[PDB]
Amino acid sequence: AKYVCKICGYIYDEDAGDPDNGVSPGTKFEEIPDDWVCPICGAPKSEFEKL
């Protein structure tokens, strides 16, 4: 699934992950550490919406 950061428009794609910030491809959004934030704007996970 894909999730959009409502603040900046960055799309978190579970298939891509966010390797530069310690999230391997295939990591489900719920499995991402609670302290991870949008890599672009710094918004907390609370500001993401599932597409």
Q: Is 41 annotated as a binding residue?
A: yes
Residue 3's Cβ-side half-sphere holds a number of Cα atoms within 13 Å equal to 22
The distance of closest approach from Cβ of residue 30 to Fe ion in the complex, given in angstroms and rounded to an integer, is: 18
The distance of closest approach from Cβ of residue 11 to Fe ion in the complex, given in angstroms and rounded to an integer, is: 10
Residue 15's Cβ-side half-sphere holds a number of Cα atoms within 13 Å equal to 2
Q: In what order do the strands lie in the sheet with 2-5?
A: 11-13, 2-5, 48-50
Give the contact letters, 10-49, x = binds to Fe ion (CB under 5 A), - = no: x---------------------------x-xx-x------
Residues binding Fe ion (CB under 5 A):
5, 7-8, 10, 38, 40-41, 43
